[model samples]
Target chain A: SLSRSEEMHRLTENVYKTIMEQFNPSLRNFIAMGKNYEKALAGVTYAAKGYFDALVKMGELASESQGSKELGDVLFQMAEVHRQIQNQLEEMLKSFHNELLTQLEQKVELDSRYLSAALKKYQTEQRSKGDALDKCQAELKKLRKKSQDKELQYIDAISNKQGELENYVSDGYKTALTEERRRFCFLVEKQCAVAKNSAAYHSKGKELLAQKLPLWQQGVDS
Target chain B: SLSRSEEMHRLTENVYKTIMEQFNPSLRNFIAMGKNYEKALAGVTYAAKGYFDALVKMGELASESQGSKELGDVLFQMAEVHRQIQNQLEEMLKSFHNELLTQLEQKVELDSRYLSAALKKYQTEQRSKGDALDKCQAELKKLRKKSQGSKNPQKYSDKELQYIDAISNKQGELENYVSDGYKTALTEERRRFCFLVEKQCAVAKNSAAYHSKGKELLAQKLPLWQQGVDS
Candidate 1:
């Protein structure tokens, strides 16, 4: 009985520590993740503008140079770089979310297991102590009653600990889910912007290329 | 004379070894600085895009909710973050360039001083040897002739070292200037993009708000599109 009680105490202490430490840090990390997401989104926006501006500048230069393929290639390369960067951002956002989820899930799972073992050990010890009290009822009636009351108190304690552990696990899961949704929304917004900007830039380049295509055709005819 | 020659040979060997050991790494470090600049540029680019996209999305949502003031506030906040990041990138680039230039300058300056001292010592040794050889010319004509012929070699060697030091100094300055230009271009590009996108998103939101207000007024007077002609 003593060994079992000691084991329960150790388990309770560990669970309490894990709950206090893991829960807040995970939330704080999620907040930092949000901030980084915003920063990366801003980066993409800047790159898009830089890219379009380069294309417009190239178009002006091309107008003077009579359909320069070199200019066209440079613009194309810039577009390609923008595309690759957007893809990388998308991939990174997904990976970050997945990693966070995996970590939080593992932490909650371990906490749940600890809480369960602790509760089971406390209950088993209480049941055994209650049986001992019943067997000694005639010999020490008042002592038996006190021992039975102590078992009841321990059961209540174990119940509260289990409830607290459940709350932590559930709250952590919800927080992780909320963060994942926010990140997804943020990335979706970023990807949309990149797509729009890329299309706009490409169309502008295409229009310029179209205007120069006829000039090249005329040259070929001559 | 033999002892002095041995001392000069040891000094020359030490100089060669020191140059081989230190100069190569210094040059390599400078080259690595360029690579670091490229990486920093990439990081800034990544961060800028992330900020802009968030602003645009926020703008769209704000318009849908008819929150013009809120949208404006968000844009302003984003602009500040963008500016902060750009400043950081610029500062980092500047510091990196300055560090490389200062290092190279110090190396060149130290090398010049060492070479100058060595050259002076060698010149003094050459003159002493020339006088001694002249006195012994009758005994050893060939040795005296060789000594005289080599009288101006120290001058030529000093000139070569001076030329190398000049070239390296010029190269370092040129690299510093070029790196500064690259960083400036990057900063300018980022700032322009941030400004233009912010303007575009803000203007679009305002236009939508105005258009919605006008439509609401029309809807109150007569629901034109609400009723179909065929119905």
Candidate 2:
């Protein structure tokens, strides 16, 4: 005796061979169209499910992206504040240098064509401040460069939020929408055509019947 | 004596009792924030998978929607043709009636008291086409209603990923503006700050080389500093 599986398989084989295979050596399309219409309806329902799945993920993405956005904002804020202080220090120092220079310049002699000795000596010694300013600018430049790097980091982070939002819109929502709509439209079209075509076929049968009755009676008379 | 399921349950209980229960009685916010940040990062790669999935679905929808759209086009086409034929029939009948009215009226008595017999006959006959036209109009009206009805269901039936876009586009719109607005404000600050240091720094090195000129410029900084102090 065959296994249950084998028996069922054999039964299917017998059914097919007995009826479908030998009945007509026709193309598969005569039957294949019928199955796909149901499949298309299933596709629409699946799309609706996918739509729900997408919406849930998008909500999650929206919520999750917030953390990164906040983190990025804080980082950029810290970097910016550092830069603001650094730039302000440069401003204040420059003002201080200018004030000292003018005070010294006042002492430089109208007695001689050049500055007086005290003024010259003070100016020369102020060269240390120049050296200091040079060092200060160097450090500021490094800070600026570092901040620029941080800016890139911040850009990368902020753009992360943007990417999530965009993905949700373009990939998730759009695709889900397109899927559901297509599925719905597909089923609608197939079902409608089947309905209308069947109705038309029935009408065609009526006309055929009306036409045939006269010929059928005439044949009887003959 | 514990089964695997019991062990699993025990392990969770341990987690709840030992670690979670006695831990700092604070909100889960700190660690949760960290986890979510990681999630946002992971969201990027997942987006690529999502992208592919969406494309495949879009393709299916595109293919399927094509079938229905074609049927709709044909039905609408038939309706239009019937309408066009009916309109043309009206136009032709009107033109003919006018042409004959003039011809018959021309044969009228010199003072134009009455139309000729043929014109009078047509005028009465024209009233009969009115009945036919009315019947035709009713049929046309039914077909038009049917075609419109077909359209109505398709219109109503367009159920997309209904919830997805509203959330994504809306949330995206909200988030995008804040991020964009923030960056723009940063740039504006940078730009506005450029005026003070921008003018002085470029000439700083050379301006300091000449004693008098350096003094003149350096002297200018005190008043600037004073304004800062005042400010």
Candidate 3:
């Protein structure tokens, strides 16, 4: 039969390996994905505003000239189209930040509390048990029975910690992952909204410009 | 009666005021409009890319899981739609820079040569004439008749004609500027609108196609996504 210390070491090694390989990476990757999405949405919002604001400025300039007032009106209509889109995007972003980003931020906090606290608790208890076993082994021959008992207790403590960590994986981490899956629906919905709006806006722009095509042609004709 | 110098001064002042108040403002406003358009197009291109690129990245992650492969496929298809639109926009931007921005740039150069140079030439001749007249007035009355008959005929006639020619040349430049520059500007603006209109049509077509394609993809895979939630 293996020594109690050897058994404890083997079990703890496996537990540590699971934490390092599977648990840590999963948390980090999920956090990174959330961050990337935040940046992407912000970039889109800024870019849309820049485009529509520029249109407004151009329309204002065009309106200043009497000869080109028709062009100005057309430009303003185009700006209005995008301005509506921008407003929608901004509203989407606000909700995303409040709801989705808050969920991610909560994950960060929960990880520190649940994951980090569990590891810390296990580490502290293991170190105390280790010290106790070492002291018992260093004592005289009369202490042999107590040393064996100390080793067994150390193994027991390690076994308990392993269970705790595994429970966290099945319960806490898995729950977080399930929440992530559910949020994908929200993302899909927003993407569809953006696509539909973009299509409508572009269609409107095309229609408005088509109406002005004949007038532009007449300018060339004369 | 007002002297020839006074008449020249009056005409030059009016031209200078028009250049300052009207012409300069118009040029500046038009140039600003062109710049705003440039910025607007760039922003749209970047925004579209940001959105599509995000979709691609998310799709990559979704594809990593066997369960979400269908969702990943839908995302990829959506990205492809925007990717095509992005390519078209880049093409449009390239042509806009080449044609429209170049036209605006040329206007700047032409203004310096046609407008500024015309004014410079007029100012230089006017100064010379003013100095000559100063010297003529300061000369003795006894020498007036002699100077008038002796040198005045050739100098007055020749210099006066030269001054008249300089003013006439400036007027011609101004007229040419208005006719040529404004016509070209109008043409460029109209052309810009036409190109944008065509691009809008393309964008609309692409978006419509994407909607249909996306609807098909989502319909196929949404059940899979829903099953995950149920389980």
Candidate 4:
């Protein structure tokens, strides 16, 4: 078994792949549609959990009933719920991206302030010295270079945090939806098997053949 | 032996009591001082660790005749370092508190915006029909009450986070300083004992008796010193 850290790494990689392959298009569409991804993700997660749970219950009921008319009705309802859930999940993914961007923007503002303070303090310290004008100028130049490096580091950190958050939300949603779908398919298959075994048409045909004639005479009588 | 959790609880309780009774002026002062108490505790702990380590080194040098002089100098330097560490820790604590307050203010602002949006949407939905007017009015009133209750919860969460951060920082600093002080004290005491034995001060003539003899000599020589002073 993989350690927890390894498992997390694998999960994150899968989420990244899913986003690039399945979710990115929808996310782009949501952005074009002017919806916020963060808010949408929250709403979709809320709705999908409800939809998936309802579908699972419907699936169990359908299985018990075979492929009766009631089962067909339940399946259709389940399909409707799945449809809504899929749409909302896409919206949610888009909103999640939007929220990341917003967070990054805030982080940039914060880092800029920190960098500015660093620069100001360095300059003020240099200004307090009475001698060594040449050395002070050299030190001031070095401080400027250091501040620039720090600013870049700050930006990278913010980007990394955003990426992690995106992967967590996206992969979590996909795993949940896929599991629910598998359960629904299992129930549907069970219902179909039951229908094939004890269907009314088959039972009625067998009864008529038994009542009318023996196996050898059935062909001649017909 | 106690469990780690139990040990932690005991230490925390003792430290809390010490802060309230020994260091802080009153219960109110402890409450009002916030992060400063944690910083001071951390500073003391750091100083203690350094003091103890110096004491250990002093023990190693006790065979030498000049060890006591060196020991005094070490103690004085340790005190100065402790004072500097205390000053820096206090400044850091103040900055930490300010940063926490700023973060809390931002959280409250963000939460209020979200709560407002939800309430506004619900209100608008309620006002859309004539039949909804009475029912919607009641719902709106309920939402308004909920929003009011939610206001303080967000702020409280921020405050709790800040408090925990302060406590964690202080605890780490405390451990460092205490270890330093313990080692310093133990080493200095050992060095003092070694110095006394090595100096042959255990002999009767070289012990307290020798100091008494010198005092008698000084008393007899006082007349000569007085004549010199008069000249």
Best TM-score among the predictions, by candidate number = 3
- Local distance difference test values of all predictions, in order: 0.42, 0.32, 0.51, 0.36
Per-residue lDDT for A203 in model 3? Answer: 46
Would you list the rank order by TM-score, best first?
3, 1, 2, 4
Candidate 3 per-residue lDDT, tens place, B55-129, comes to 676667656542444556666766776676566656656655665555545654455445556556656665565
Model 3 residue B225 lDDT score: 44
Once superposed on the true structure, which residue ranges of model 4 sit more than 4 Å away at CA?
A1-36, A57-61, A64-110, A125-222, B1-231
Task: Rank by lDDT, highest first.
Answer: 3, 1, 4, 2
lDDT value, residue B118 of candidate 3: 57
Question: Of 1 and 3, which scores higher on DockQ?
Answer: 3
Candidate 2 chain B weakest ten by summed lDDT: B18-27
- Model 1 lDDT, residue A21, Cα: 54
Q: What share of the true interface contacts does candidate 4 keep?
A: 0.00
lDDT of 3 by residue, A1-222 (tens): 224544444444444444344433554554455455556556656555555555565566556542445655655666675565456556656665665556545644445345445555555655665566555445533455555665565556556654554443344334434444444444455455445544544444445445544554443343
TM match of model 1 to true structure:
0.27
A56-102 per-residue lDDT for model 4 (tens digits) = 44334334321222332333343343454345335434433444334
Model 3 gets an lDDT of 0.51
User: Interface RMSD for candidate number 2?
Assistant: 34.4
Candidate closest to the true structure, highest lDDT: 3
Error of 4 at A101 (Å): 7.4
Q: RMSD per prediction, one decimal?
A: 25.7, 50.2, 13.2, 49.2
Instruction: Go through the candidates in order and give each one's DockQ.
Output: 0.02, 0.01, 0.05, 0.00
